[PDB]
Each structure stands twice: as structure tokens, then as C-alpha cells.
């Protein structure tokens, strides 16, 4: 009788309407003086550490953020970067992140 589920609202395309993009730019802006422009790579990876709680696990968070070894990410690029950081403080399981995806650490399945 407890734990119900009369609500339907999946998530993927990050669909929205100035409801999340506003808070997404207010952060990337705290460091980026320009309205949009692009933030550096070592600069964003410096504060990005604020969710995984201890254990520096930003190695996979950034590996997915950057996509051209440019060590930089325009504002549009940061829009997805933070989307991955919230997944930790949100409690969302890890769907993907690396090319592989089966048992790179559990060979013996028995
Ligand atoms: Ca990039």
C-alpha cells in the first residue's frame, strides 16, 4: 500500500524551458565573466569537485564533458557537464560513461 507511482516523467533530452538553463548559466558564469563564451578545462575541473563526496571521481565526469581535447567547453558544452554532476547528488544510477559496458571488472560471471 506504500511506495506509489502515479507520476510519469522520464528524462533524457534534458527538455525544459529556461527552468534549468538559467541556473546552468548562472554557475558557468560565476567563473566566465562573458555572457556565454567558453570556460577552460582545468578551471572547470577545479571546482567541479563538489558532489562525488571525497574520492576524486571527476575523471569520468570530465572525460565525457570534453569532446575534442580542446581543454575548453563553450557554455553550450557546460550545459551537459553539470547535468552529469547532478546525477550524483540526485541518486541516478550510471547508465553509460565508457566505450565498454558489461563486466570489465567482473569477468568470471558464474
Ligand atoms: Ca570540449
Amino acid at each position: 500500500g506504500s511506495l506509489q507511482d502515479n507520476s510519469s516523467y522520464p528524462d533524457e533530452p534534458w527538455r525544459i524551458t529556461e527552468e534549468q538553463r538559467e541556473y546552468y548559466v548562472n554557475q558557468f558564469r560565476s567563473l566566465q565573466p562573458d555572457p556565454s563564451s567558453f570556460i577552460s578545462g582545468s578551471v572547470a575541473k577545479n571546482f567541479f569537485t563538489k558532489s562525488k563526496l571525497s574520492i576524486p571521481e571527476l575523471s569520468y565526469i570530465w572525460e565525457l564533458s570534453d569532446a575534442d581535447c580542446d581543454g575548453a567547453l563553450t557554455l553550450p558544452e557546460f550545459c551537459a557537464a553539470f547535468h552529469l554532476i547532478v546525477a550524483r547528488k540526485n541518486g541516478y544510477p550510471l547508465p553509460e560513461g565508457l566505450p565498454p559496458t558489461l563486466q570489465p571488472e567482473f569477468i568470471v560471471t558464474d
Side-chain angles (χ1 to χ4, degrees):
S2 206
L3 252 295
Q4 265 211 117
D5 225 14
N6 287 306
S7 47
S8 208
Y9 65 113
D11 181 22
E12 263 217 277
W14 316 124
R15 225 258 235 177
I16 205 100
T17 171
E18 253 205 48
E19 270 286 341
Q20 74 172 194
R21 234 238 257 127
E22 269 285 272
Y23 179 34
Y24 276 136
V25 184
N26 205 14
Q27 145 54 231
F28 162 109
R29 173 193 147 74
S30 197
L31 320 111
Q32 187 44 221
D34 264 19
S36 292
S37 226
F38 72 98
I39 275 176
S40 337
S42 59
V43 163
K45 256 233 294 150
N46 181 45
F47 91 84
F48 265 28
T49 181
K50 41 167 283 116
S51 210
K52 91 294 223 255
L53 296 129
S54 171
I55 283 160
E57 211 68 50
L58 284 163
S59 158
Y60 78 87
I61 287 300
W62 165 262
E63 244 234 298
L64 306 153
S65 188
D66 188 35
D68 51 4
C69 270
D70 72 321
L73 288 98
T74 69
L75 163 119
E77 267 215 31
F78 164 102
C79 199
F82 237 41
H83 263 137
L84 308 174
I85 278 86
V86 177
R88 187 75 216 172
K89 245 310 119 179
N90 200 332
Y92 270 135
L94 253 303
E96 254 132 13
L98 60 138
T101 158
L102 34 130
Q103 66 228 44
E105 186 120 69
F106 206 60
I107 290 171
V108 54
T109 331
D110 262 324

